[PDB]
Amino acid sequence: SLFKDDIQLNEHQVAWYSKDWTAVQSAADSFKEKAENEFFEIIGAINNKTKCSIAQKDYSKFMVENALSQFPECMPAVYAMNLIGSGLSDEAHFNYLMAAVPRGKRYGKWAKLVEDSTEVLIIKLLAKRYQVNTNDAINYKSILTKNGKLPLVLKELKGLVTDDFLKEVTKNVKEQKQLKKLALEW
Amino acid sequence: MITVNEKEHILEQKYRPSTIDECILPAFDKETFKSITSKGKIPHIILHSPSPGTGKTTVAKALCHDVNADMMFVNGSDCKIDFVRGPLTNFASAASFDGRQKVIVIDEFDRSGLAESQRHLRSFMEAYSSNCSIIITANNIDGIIKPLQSRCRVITFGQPTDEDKIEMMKQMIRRLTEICKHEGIAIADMKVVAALVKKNFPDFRKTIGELDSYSSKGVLDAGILSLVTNDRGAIDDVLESLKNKDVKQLRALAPKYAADYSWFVGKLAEEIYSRVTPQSIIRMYEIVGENNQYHGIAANTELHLAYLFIQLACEMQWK
Amino acid sequence: MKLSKDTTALLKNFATINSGIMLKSGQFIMTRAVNGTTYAEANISDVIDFDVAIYDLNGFLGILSLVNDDAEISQSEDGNIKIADARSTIFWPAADPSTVVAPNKPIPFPVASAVTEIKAEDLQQLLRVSRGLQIDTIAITVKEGKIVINGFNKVEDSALTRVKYSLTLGDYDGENTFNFIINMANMKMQPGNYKLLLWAKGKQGAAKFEGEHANYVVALEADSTHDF
Amino acid sequence: MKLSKDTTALLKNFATINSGIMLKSGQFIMTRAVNGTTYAEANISDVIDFDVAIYDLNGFLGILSLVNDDAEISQSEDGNIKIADARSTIFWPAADPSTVVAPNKPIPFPVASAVTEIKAEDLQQLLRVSRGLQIDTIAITVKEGKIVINGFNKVEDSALTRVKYSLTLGDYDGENTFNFIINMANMKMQPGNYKLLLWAKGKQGAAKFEGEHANYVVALEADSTHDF
Amino acid sequence: MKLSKDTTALLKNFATINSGIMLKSGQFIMTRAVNGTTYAEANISDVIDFDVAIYDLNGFLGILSLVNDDAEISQSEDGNIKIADARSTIFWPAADPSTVVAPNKPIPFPVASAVTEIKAEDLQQLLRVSRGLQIDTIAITVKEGKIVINGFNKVEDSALTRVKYSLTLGDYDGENTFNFIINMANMKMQPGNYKLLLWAKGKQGAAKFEGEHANYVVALEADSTHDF
DNA sequence: TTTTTATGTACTCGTAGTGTCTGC
DNA sequence: GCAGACACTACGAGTACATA
Ligand SMILES: [Mg+2]
Fold first, then answer.
1. Where in chain A is the domain with CATH 1.10.8.700?
2. How many Cβ atoms are within 10 Å of A49's Cβ, its own excluded?
3. Of B57, B41, B56, which is closest to residue B102 (Cα–Cα)?
4. B57 labelled ligand-binding
5. Where are the domains of chain E?
6. b/e C62-79 (16+ beta carbons within 10 angstroms → b)
7. Which of B231, C129, D185, E29 is the most buried (most CB within 10 A)?
8. Angstrom distance (rounded) from CA B298 to CA B293
9. What number of CA atoms fall less than 13 Å from residue D190's CA on the CB side?
10. What's the farthest any 2 CA atoms get from each other in chain D?
């Protein structure tokens, strides 16, 4: 901190002029700021009957179909492009929707279910040890409470929680609250 | 008035404008560029189309030319992180010894795999902002990370006003005329020049590239006008037979286009959309969409095309 | 203005406190860490006969290894650096002053709050020692009369109490027990024998090692407690 | 219990053959694949002091390069494990045996139909030719009295016809004819001198690789052909 | 037929020009790059006794380090390449000529527009510097009655505006004036002293290096300029 | 004002780890 | 002769597109 007169060189200027790239990097990483899309001005036009004309902007037959999939007033039209639309021009799939789904409004919230993260890990586990697909696995868990005492079996299987396997269950440090959680109360 | 490069035969690159005035642009846009060249210093800028050949990468070099910058021109896809650390850091830190604005032109920077380089650039732009500025050229903005658009004046092309379009077109016609004098191309009918411009409007590159291919015979006459306004493949015989609701004719055209179906079906959607009433549109997609969908299960493809025609004939209410 | 095995050597080192450097005219040269933490001055045989700033020193010097020792360096026509060799010539870029951090002035060291010294292998011993066992910080302080250094690993020894190497320097005539700390990557000086002046006036202090070639000054670390 | 520098290396190696392992008390380890293709046994000089099952091996040997080498790996106070360190302590999961495929069959290689040796430097040459000459199967057999190896290319040369490689391994004296084919994929030993004992009666069979640091036994591919 | 270290060091070179090669009986070998930019011809120690096309040169040369330095080679009954060792033996796929872009014969070099020569000592310094100086292309013109050479940075440079380097070759006897630019990338020659043969018939134009071992031709750059 | 299906296939980037070879 | 430093490879991250 010598010299004692430096108009502070900004976090960047120091990164670069000194040329250690690892500090330059974290300065890079600074703005990663990941978000994008504007697909809701496309949904909006199909709804409000304004004009966009597409072509210019990226379009998602999956994203437009799903968004509308919300309001039952639309399902007839989406249902249509769903059976039939596989194989239509994005230009088309769009032009159609303009001329079918009639009113306009929608407010935001999609419906996503509530996952008990624990319950999913448990079924994903059972289907692993037992080489069954997910529906029997759910049967097993229903059964395995009501006798044969789920702690007996979760204790045997706590063996494979391999943290490759957790990445399959949730996506965050919620995922590390779980490593511990069945390592525990059985 | 017109800059010619003379090291190129390819002719849409022979006539590439040297300065900001030679460029044909929307009024407000030209004016904002004059404003910039006036102040003598050039900010960080993004030029984007997404329609090709509106003049983005041309105006990039012109802006530099007008302010007399020391300019490094760089292919976007060549500008990976080690380039920015390497060659660009050198140039951006070095001092031009005539006191010229230093400017780095990164052309066609909208590639996806360069996001890592672009982030690395966001810190750079603030460090070296005193020396030199960056002009990015892009076809699709979303390929430019948000913090780079924050740091720039984003100027957006080829989306003129209704008036600009009318002026720009006059300006482009005047220009084409002038290119013809120079090139030895005889203009018999001015109507064909106004037609080439209108045909390919946003894209001024293709509009000149066209002129080369219709000049085979050194003259533009009423006969060339037929080929410029005319449609070389088309759909017309089907569209017409559909309106007339006749069948023997539809029955006969089937085998013609069964040849390549996926393309034909596409044109038919595109072309009927314009020619039929609003709730006929919604019906036509259900009819064409369903037909397209089962094609490739359907065993006789020529018949499957006939089936499509009979279907549309009856249900299409034509505006 | 040719350059000798002697003067290039010391310069490859300044290249490690700071990548670029600014040299003025004299037999005088000096650099600093962009961030402050470090510094270094020196006088040398050969004579700098023009003002110029460099961006890529480590690079610049590599380029010199490739021409004739008797290669005369000049300020080139435009104002960059012409390196005229035997039957060839190289032109390396003069860089923009405002993109190279050099010392404002040759910071003048106060009087010693403390004085002692160090030995070449001792400095060799230490430098060598740390990284191996993972040490990355140290501390000079009075211990049983004399002065000694205690090397820590501040990554796995946060609050600094499990020494992992130690070296004695020479006893302490004055009277009070102080405690000085330095980061380890901050120790750029070249081995050999250095007289070690120490200093303090606030939560701020310094430490100017004196070698028989050049001088190095290193800041302290925030949690050092002098006894003044 | 404590695990050495040589033991752990037969542990990264037994991971290339099974995700999981079960070693038990003794000075013996062994594992074989969930597809019963590949068997590997090894006698170590660190004496394993209890019966444990790990769902994952190559995961465990990871939390073990970090800890220093005291590593009193004991058993946790709740059925899991305890890696004791010079200065820390770590806890790995421990799987119910129902979740690991363990050999359970220290069956003894019957008797050798024929025996022969291979020099380690000459495993070298083959483990490497095959890489860039593109081999994926080989066949051990008799050419001109000695026992040879042929490398082929099951994909390009669909029926082992054009030999991309041959290697000569010291004569056969017994009077038999044979052609033992092995899918290179299912071959996983670290180099070294290896005794080669190959057995087969009629159609069932296998090859056993005796080495001074481990033992290896794999299965002839579909078509191998002999008269024993 | 056998091949020695010296021979191969060549072909490992000729690889960097064309990854394939066709070669026939004699002490002559040659390759020209697929794209029509460079070409090398070679007289060599070892002796070729049959025609053969190699698809993957850069790795055949590789296979060859995988046996002793002496193994004999020939055309197999198998009309492929047999590298036979003391103990082992390899069988390298000889490719169909159709696919190995080779030169039918040897085209003479236009009695040279201009002549001069370059010390191998000198040329090492060019390559050496070019890494150091990011010199990607060069130009050979006439500065004051002598033949110079200038390295550039076509990247940062664009117009070849500023010279970063300038060897000084011979003197210029005759009275034309020119500027022959050369893509550094296109310069694939094992170092050693060369005679230099330049040529141009207007828009036509090339450059020939005349070694002690082989001769090399590279294409000028698009606006190499001259009055020939 | 809202926000991403599951399987298989292909391609580019950066970086880290890996190996063979040469100047002071 | 060995480090240094170069050239190469393997991998994981993010993007993409056709199917269902
Ligand atoms: Mg462009």
1. 113-186
2. 13
3. B41
4. yes
5. 2-228
6. bbbebbeeebebeebeee
7. E29
8. 10
9. 13
10. 64
- Find out if CATH 1.10.8.700 is the number for domain A113-186: yes
**Residue of chain A whose alpha carbon sits nearest to that of B270:** A92
* Phi-psi label, residue D142: left if phi above 0, alpha if psi -120 to 50, beta otherwise: beta
Closest chain A C-alpha to D59 CA, distance in angstroms: 9
Cα E18–Cα E21–Cα E26 angle in degrees, nearest 5: 130
Given a contact cutoff of 8 angstroms between Cβ atoms, the answer to whether B186 and B219 are in contact is: yes
Q: How far is CA A171 from the centre of its chain?
A: 9
- D167–E63: do the CB atoms touch at under 8 Å? no
CATH for the stretch A35-112: 1.20.272.50
Q: In angstroms, how far is F23 C1' from E121 CA? A: 15
- As a whole number of angstroms, the distance between CA D178 and CA D187 comes to 20
Q: Is B115 near strand G, with its CB below 7 A from some atom of it?
A: yes
Single-letter residue type at A18: S
Q: How many CB pairs under 8 A join D and E?
A: 33
Contacts of A136 (CB under 8 A, 6+ apart): A127, A130
Q: Count the neighbouring beta carbons within 10 Å of the beta carbon of residue B161.
A: 12
Residues of chain A with CATH 1.20.272.50: 35-112
Final resolution, Å: 3.3
CB B278 within 8 A of CB A100: no
| CB C88, CB E165: distance < 8 Å | yes
CA B2 to chain centre: 22
Considering Cα of C161, then C165, then C169, then C171, what sign does the dihedral take?
positive
The partner residues of D114 in beta bridges, in order of sequence, read D198
The CATH code belonging to domain B162-228 is: 1.10.8.60
Provide CATH code, domain B229-319.
1.20.272.10
Q: Which amino acid is at E212?
A: E
- What are the structure tokens assigned to A160, written together? 């494979």
Which technique?
X-ray
Radius of gyration of chain E (CA): 20
> Where in chain B are the domains?
1-161, 162-228, 229-319
Of C18, C19, C107, nearest to A3 by CB-CB distance is: C107
CA distances from B131 to B99, C98, C166, D70, D105 (A): 10, 9, 49, 59, 75
Q: Are B273 and B266 in contact (CB under 8 A)?
A: no
Q: How far C50 CA sits from the closest chain E CA (Å)? A: 20
Q: What's the rounded Cα separation, in Å, for the pair C121 and C169?
A: 12
Query: Is the domain A1-34 a CATH 6.10.250.1260 member?
Result: yes
Q: Report how far ligand 1's centroid is from the alpha carbon of B54 (Å).
A: 9
DSSP state of D184: G
Q: What CATH number labels B1-161?
A: 3.40.50.300
Cα of first residue to Cα of last residue in chain E, in angstroms, is 47
CB atoms within 10 A of CB E78: 12
Q: In CATH, what class is E2-228?
A: alpha beta
Other Cβ atoms within 10 Å of D96 Cβ, number: 17
**Those residues with Cβ within 8 angstroms of residue E54's Cβ, 6 or more apart along the chain or in another chain:** E20, E21, E22, E23, E60, E81, E92, E94, E95, E100
**Closest of C170, C222, C159, C176 to residue C196, by C-alpha:** C170
Q: Give the long-range contacts of residues E86-90, CB within 8 A, separation 24 or more.
A: E87/D122, E87/D167, E87/D168, E88/D122, E88/D125, E88/D165, E88/D166, E88/D167, E88/D168, E89/D165, E89/D166, E89/D167, E90/D129, E90/D133, E90/D164, E90/D165, E90/E63, E90/E66
Question: Which tokens hold the place of D210?
Answer: 């005796």
Rounded Cα distance between E72 and A63, Å, is 66
Using the Cβ of E60 and the Cβ atoms of chain D, whether some distance falls under 8 Å is answered with no
The one-letter code for the residue type at B277 is: T
Residue given tokens 């080690």 in the structure block: B82
| Cβ of A62 near strand G (distance < 7 A) | yes
